[PDB]
Amino acid sequence: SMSVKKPKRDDSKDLALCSMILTEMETHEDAWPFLLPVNLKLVPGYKKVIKKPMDFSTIREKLSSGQYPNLETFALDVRLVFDNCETFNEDDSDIGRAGHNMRKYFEKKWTDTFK
Numbered sequence: 001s002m003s004v005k006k007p008k009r010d011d012s013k014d015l016a017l018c019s020m021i022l023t024e025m026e027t028h029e030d031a032w033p034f035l036l037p038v039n040l041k042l043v044p045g046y047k048k049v050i051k052k053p054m055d056f057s058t059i060r061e062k063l064s065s066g067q068y069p070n071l072e073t074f075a076l077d078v079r080l081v082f083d084n085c086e087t088f089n090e091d092d093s094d095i096g097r098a099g100h101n102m103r104k105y106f107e108k109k110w111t112d113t114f115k
Helices: 014-026 056-064 071-088 094-114
Strands: none
Touching (some): 014 094, 056 071
8 A cells, every 4th residue: 555565576577588488489380370460351250259359479569669568468468369269269270279289388488487
């Protein structure tokens, strides 16, 4: 509360560390569905159904331009990529499996780097 604070957690490396995670996600062999924004002209249903599109290139540009206020807003956009993928794609499809695999990969790196 006013004039009562928990001890200051060192957040000075968070930007660098989220960039490293994001690089590892970009270079994963199963990243291909997520590298670029879904083409809303060419994919029926996407625009109406997926209210907040997100992709790795969009996260990279937000990261690089100071549009994440803290590491939790970064994790929210990464998770959005996978939540969108599960909304639109069957579990038993190449893309649906890619999304599960990537979500797992991310959540381990997130735990190991920060928790």
